[PDB]
């Protein structure tokens, strides 16, 4: 099986700028006929894939001119002249040389944003859930950049890894920002056996973890 | 003029099998290969195999051994892919892509097969109100806990308060989904005015309005 390796995200691109996404194939994709069978597909959020480039360097009717494609042997690249918002999505390269047809993990095109710190908020288990015999503490880290962030939960000054559930939004369409939601779910009984709950965020913007907490 | 209409969303029980359709229009169906691809949230695009409508010839990707079976109905310009002996590892989106001019230059809608043994369960929506309320902006939220299957539509104040909201992807904990949504508004406007999240879950026909009220 031929393997295709792509990065998860492209280097951050400031709108109007230029951008390129790489892709390497575990074997030459050149065919006896002289055609290199590497293909490019873009998948805009909430849509079906779309063919952009075929046979390494050709544009598919309909695709904008600012989309070009090149490559050397087992190394390829998709280049976007001047990136428009509409160009955001995940890009997949695909080898159509031999069976099985195989694609790369796809590369998400990220946009460059000015560093932004995490707006953290923590919330105590609701009154209603406390009746269900359960208690989860929710903590929001919204509108931060760059994306890499870390969060640790503490109960009375002592971290706890269990009971934590995380979710992460995709780069926003207006902020080019990132957000995250953490949730520590405990027993109403275990919850009431302690008093201090803290949500700490460790992000590049600051040296000290951002700290939000509450007690009883 | 060339369009491929795939079947709708499917929820199936492990063990069972599913048939996805892909009806074609706009080109002579019989003369062009129809490819099937599989896309799982955590992977790339995995190629299942293709079928040539005219003589029903067919080639598969070993990895989709006796899982997928491609068939064609010349009389409906329809192609079908049948996955049998369903497992949660089969939960994914299944595209059908025909190669009219260049490999997979026309893609289907991307049906979504979900395999679970879970029963439709109503979401428990708990309000997330600020612990001890300082600052100038305030963030409130809602927790839509333990529901199945997806999706659930969240809105604030029937949608009017769509300003700076953030609805996070759902997470699967013990066969049940749980997502949270946060909304950020000016302090002068809360508790001043009411803030409400509208959680809808079609499957269970439930609709809940949660009045975000101050703790006690």
């Amino acid at each position: 099986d031929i393997v295709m390796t792509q990065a998860a995200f492209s280097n951050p691109v400031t709108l109007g700028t230029s951008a390129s996404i790489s892709c390497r194939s575990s074997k030459s994709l050149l065919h006896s006929n002289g055609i290199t069978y590497l293909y490019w597909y873009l998948q805009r959020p909430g849509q079906s894939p779309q063919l952009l480039i075929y046979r390494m360097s050709n544009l598919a009717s309909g695709v904008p001119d600012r989309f070009s494609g090149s490559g050397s042997g087992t190394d390829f690249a998709l280049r976007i002249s001047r990136v428009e918002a509409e160009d955001v999505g995940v890009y997949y390269c695909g080898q159509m040389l031999e069976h099985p047809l195989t694609f790369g993990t796809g590369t998400k095109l990220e946009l460059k944003r000015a560093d932004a710190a995490p707006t953290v908020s923590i919330f105590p288990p609701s009154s209603e859930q406390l009746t269900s015999g359960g208690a989860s503490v929710v903590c929001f880290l919204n509108n931060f950049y760059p994306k890499d962030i870390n969060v640790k939960w503490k109960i009375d000054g002592s971290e706890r890894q269990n009971g934590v559930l995380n979710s992460w939004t995709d780069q926003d369409s207006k902020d080019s920002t990132y957000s995250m939601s953490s949730t520590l779910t405990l027993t109403k009984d275990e919850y009431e056996r302690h008093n201090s709950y803290t949500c700490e965020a460790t992000h590049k913007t600051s040296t000290s973890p951002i700290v939000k907490s509450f007690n009883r | 003029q060339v369009q491929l209409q795939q079947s709708g969303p499917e929820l199936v029980r492990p063990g069972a099998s599913v048939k996805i359709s892909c009806k074609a229009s706009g080109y002579t169906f019989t003369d062009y290969y129809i490819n099937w691809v599989k896309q799982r949230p955590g992977q790339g695009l995995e190629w299942i195999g293709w079928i040539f409508p005219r003589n029903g010839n067919t080639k598969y990707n070993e990895k989709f051994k006796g899982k997928a079976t491609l068939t064609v109905d010349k009389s409906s310009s329809t192609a079908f892919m049948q996955l049998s002996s369903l497992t949660s590892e089969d939960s994914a989106v299944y595209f059908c892509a025909t190669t009219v001019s260049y490999v997979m230059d026309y893609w289907g809608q991307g049906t979504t097969v979900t395999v679970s043994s879970a029963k439709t369960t109503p979401p428990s929506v708990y309000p997330l109100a600020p612990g001890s309320a300082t600052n100038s902006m305030v963030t409130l939220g809602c927790l839509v806990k333990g529901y199945f299957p997806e999706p659930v539509t969240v809105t604030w104040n029937s949608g009017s308060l769509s300003s700076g909201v953030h609805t996070f992807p759902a997470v699967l904990q013990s066969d049940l989904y749980t997502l949270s949504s946060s909304v950020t508004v000016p302090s002068s406007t809360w508790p001043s005015e009411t803030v409400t999240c509208n959680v809808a879950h079609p499957a269970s026909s439930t609709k809940v309005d949660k009045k975000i009220v101050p703790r006690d």
């Binding site: 055609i35 069978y37 293909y39 046979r55 159509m96 | 062009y32 290969y33 260049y102 490999v103």
Partner: peptide, 6 residues
Amino acid sequence: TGALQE
């Protein structure tokens, strides 16, 4: 394969 399908 594109050499077959195209």
